[PDB]
Amino acid sequence: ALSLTADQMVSALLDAEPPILYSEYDPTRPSMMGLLTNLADRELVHMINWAKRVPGFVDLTLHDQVHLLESAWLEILMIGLVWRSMEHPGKLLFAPNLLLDRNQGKSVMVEIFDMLLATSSRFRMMNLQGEEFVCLKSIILLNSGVYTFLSSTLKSLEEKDHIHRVLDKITDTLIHLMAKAGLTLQQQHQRLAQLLLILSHIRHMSNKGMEHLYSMKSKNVVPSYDLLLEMLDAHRLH
Amino acid sequence: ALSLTADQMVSALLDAEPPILYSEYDPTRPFSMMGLLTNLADRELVHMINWAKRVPGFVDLTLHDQVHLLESAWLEILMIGLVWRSMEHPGKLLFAPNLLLDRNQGKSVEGMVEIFDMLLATSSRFRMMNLQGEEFVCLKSIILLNSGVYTFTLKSLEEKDHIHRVLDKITDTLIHLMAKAGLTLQQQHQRLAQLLLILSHIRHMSNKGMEHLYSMKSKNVVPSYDLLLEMLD
Numbered sequence: 007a008l009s010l011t012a013d014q015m016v017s018a019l020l021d022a023e024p025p026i027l028y029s030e031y032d033p034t035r036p037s038m039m040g041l042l043t044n045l046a047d048r049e050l051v052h053m054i055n056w057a058k059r060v061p062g063f064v065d066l067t068l069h070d071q072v073h074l075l076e077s078a079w080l081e082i083l084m085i086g087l088v089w090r091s092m093e094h095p096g097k098l099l100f101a102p103n104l105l106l107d108r109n110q111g112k113s114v115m116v117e118i119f120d121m122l123l124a125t126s127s128r129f130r131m132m133n134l135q136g137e138e139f140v141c142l143k144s145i146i147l148l149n150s151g152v153y154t155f156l157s158s159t160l161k162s163l164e165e166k167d168h169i170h171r172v173l174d175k176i177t178d179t180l181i182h183l184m185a186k187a188g189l190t191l192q193q194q195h196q197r198l199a200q201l202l203l204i205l206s207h208i209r210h211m212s213n214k215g216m217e218h219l220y221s222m223k224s225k226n227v228v229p230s231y232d233l234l235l236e237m238l239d240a241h242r243l244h
Numbered sequence: 245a246l247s248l249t250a251d252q253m254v255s256a257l258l259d260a261e262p263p264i265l266y267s268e269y270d271p272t273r274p275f276s277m278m279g280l281l282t283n284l285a286d287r288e289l290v291h292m293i294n295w296a297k298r299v300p301g302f303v304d305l306t307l308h309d310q311v312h313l314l315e316s317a318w319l320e321i322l323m324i325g326l327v328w329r330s331m332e333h334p335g336k337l338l339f340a341p342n343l344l345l346d347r348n349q350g351k352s353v354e355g356m357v358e359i360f361d362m363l364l365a366t367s368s369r370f371r372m373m374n375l376q377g378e379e380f381v382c383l384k385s386i387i388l389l390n391s392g393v394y395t396f397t398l399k400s401l402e403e404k405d406h407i408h409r410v411l412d413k414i415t416d417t418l419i420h421l422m423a424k425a426g427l428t429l430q431q432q433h434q435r436l437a438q439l440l441l442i443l444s445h446i447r448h449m450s451n452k453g454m455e456h457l458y459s460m461k462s463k464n465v466v467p468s469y470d471l472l473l474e475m476l477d
């Protein structure tokens with residue numbers, strides 16, 4: 007678990023990658039938020055499966071797993087989107103059959119389209135690599151909720167220590183990747199820093215986004231603890 | 245500014261540090277929490293502008309871009325300051341030397357104890373990491389340069405490039421500090437990452453806080469571009 011080598015970490019993360027889903031609409035017919043919501047809902051099921059395959063995540067309590075996903079899920083959809091969109095300047099590839107520019111975001115939203123587009127830009131600028139992307143996405147999963155375990159039972163302390171050890175392992179892994187690519191030591195820590203500072207912006211976008219979903223006043227429109235629990239709380243019967 | 249050594253960067257940042265202000269209230273009268281905190285934050289902001297102008301590379305930017313960066317960062321910068329001076333007061337927030345509050349005192353306005361709890365947890369994280377003063381001023385400068393840089397023409401391309409060069413320099417500086425402290429190369433990279441990942445939480449806290457002040461519907465409870473412009477210009 008914490009015994010994995012760097013290439014073992016990378017391979018594990020790459021293997022765990024969720025699928026790219028399609029928007030569900032009649033391509034033979036002439037709804038924006040509805041399309042985006044349906045897509046996100048289906049992605050979330052796959053995100054749970056992905057999380058359970060991030061090395062060290064299942065070692066956590068069921069409760070702490072839920073807490074981490076409750077905190078990170080929109081950031082994770084967003085970094086997924088920004089990655090998919092990297093090779094489509096000016097557009098967001100929500101799905102292979104749903105490629106939108108900023109003008110199409112005006113039907114509701116263009117404020118958060120603009121933020122997403124700029125992140126995609128920034129990724130393009132840095133020439134972000136696939137192996138770097140999956141590290142970052144796992145870092146979001148582990149880090150986003152780790153400061154909000156309002157708890158300090160012995161168990162909670164052990165949980166927080168474990169999470170920071172897994173995070174250290176991914177740091178080592180990112181550095182390894184950049185060493186593997188020929189970067190100098192200075193280039194390595196500079197790029198590590200550049201990559202991690204983008205995570206703050208992704209946090210920001212998730213907050214502006216959560217702000218919309220909460221403004222809708224829809225009873226299901228933000229995944230409840232209980233929904234996330236139902237989805238993570240698997241049996242071993244299959 | 246891009247020609248500073250790591251030690252010169254650290255000296256510059258340490259010298260740039262704003263003063264610790266006091267809360268303004270009559271200490272002889274019986275103990276408005278929001279009013280006290282707002283008055284304190286208002287006065288800190290003026291000193292923040294002076295500090296920002298002293299961060300190496302900041303005044304090299306256009307005045308427009310200076311304003312944009314402060315507009316994005318100002319609440320994060322107040323928050324990291326608070327968390328830092330609270331570090332050695334477990335369970336409390338040292339808003340000012342004469343205003344040390346625990347979470348119970350945060351319950352006076354609705355929606356405030358949640359923000360208190362987050363601030364306290366960050367302070368705890370700082371305590372656990374044994375955060376050093378030199379690291380703190382690096383981090384605060386990083387917030388200033390980074391928070392607005394993804395939400396901005398050839399001039400703008402040049403501005404963004406400059407900002408990222410200054411950020412790289414502060415990264416170099418943090419690593420140099422950890423080197424001086426004798427950490428291994430592995431430990432250096434791990435601690436760099438741990439420090440930077442806390443900045444995501446501080447952003448989160450700023451967003452929750454901005455949400456409070458916007459909810460107040462007070463005419464100028466969020467500092468305007470033009471007020472920031474006036475103080476910077």
Ligand SMILES: C[C@@H]1CCCN1CCOc1ccc([C@@H]2c3ccc(O)cc3CC[C@@H]2c2ccccc2)cc1
Pocket residue numbers: 042043045046047048049050080083084086087100115118215216218219226227228229
């Ligand atoms: C999907 C969630 C899970 C349970 C309830 N359901 C609420 C729907 O929340 C969303 C999440 C993301 C989006 C949009 C989106 C969809 C898929 C994806 O891969 C990325 C994103 C990025 C955010 C985007 C969005 C979010 C808020 C407001 C406008 C657009 C829209 C609605």
Ligand SMILES: C[C@@H]1CCCN1CCOc1ccc([C@@H]2c3ccc(O)cc3CC[C@@H]2c2ccccc2)cc1
Pocket residue numbers: 281282284285286288289319322323325326339356359453454456457464465466467
């Ligand atoms: C600060 C700005 C300047 C122009 C308008 N004015 C609005 C008042 O804004 C604030 C900012 C921070 C606070 C609280 C604060 C005070 C001093 C400081 O050094 C640290 C902080 C941390 C945030 C805190 C707060 C913020 C929002 C809601 C509750 C508590 C309160 C009001």
